[PDB]
Amino acid sequence: MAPIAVGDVLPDGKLAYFDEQDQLQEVSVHSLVAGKKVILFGVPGAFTPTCSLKHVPGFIEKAGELKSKGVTEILCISVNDPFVMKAWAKSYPENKHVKFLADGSATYTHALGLELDLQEKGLGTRSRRFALLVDDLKVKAANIEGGGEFTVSSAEDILKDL
């Protein structure tokens, strides 16, 4: 696939997470995003430095501002399994609004055209870093990095065009 772009319809797919009683759930992407304005941001890896100290904290810190400007859900996707994503979410006890979603087989990431080859670096195939603004399945903003750098995909850069 070519990278998803502004004006495209967001594809469906299945993502995994733990519920409040600590049970494994798997739901569709459209079950979390249809009929509403959302942000979906992608990271190359749970527990990696840029993702963990810069990219995710930006969303937690700006969540209030973003929700006051119409955002109804803020979803973080990674090519990691839901066991790892549960441990990663627990490292942010401060976080009430970011949902951590698991695409650990990279299926949804390839449907977005956002696969990234990190074989040499020791992470296998992951997602490119990115942030999308999506309003009832229509992509309104698509801020997509080449690889895992951090230049266009911050919370601040989605906020500024809301």
Instruction: Kindly report the three-state secondary structure assignment for every residue of the chain.
Output: CCCCCCCCECCCCEEEEECCCCCEEEEECHHHHCCCEEEEEEECCCCCHHHHHHHHHHHHHHHHHHHHCCCCEEEEEECCCHHHHHHHHHCCCCCCCEEEEECCCCHHHHHCCCEEEECCCCCEEEECCEEEEEECCEEEEEEECCCCCCCCCCHHHHHCCC
| CA distance linking residue 161 with residue 88, whole number of Å | 29
The range of the structural domain enclosing residue 148 comes to: 1-162
Q: Rounded to an integer, what distance in angstroms lies between the CA atom of residue 155 and that of residue 130? A: 10
**Residue 35, exposed/middle/buried by CB under 10 A (0-12, 13-18, 19+)?**
exposed
Number of structural domains found in the chain = 1
Cα 119 from Cα 161, distance rounded (Å): 35
- Close Cβ partners of 128 (under 8 Å, ≥ 6 residues apart): 3, 42, 44, 114, 115, 116, 144, 145, 146, 147, 148
Return d(Cα 63, Cα 29) in angstroms, integer: 20
Experimental method: X-ray
Of 33, 51, 85, 144, the active-site residue reads 51
Question: Residue 38 forms beta bridges with which residues?
Answer: 73, 134
CATH assignment of the domain containing 94: 3.40.30.10
Q: How many CA atoms lie within 13 A of 133 on its CB side?
A: 18
- Maximum separation of any 2 CA atoms in the chain, in Å: 42
**51 an active-site residue?**
yes
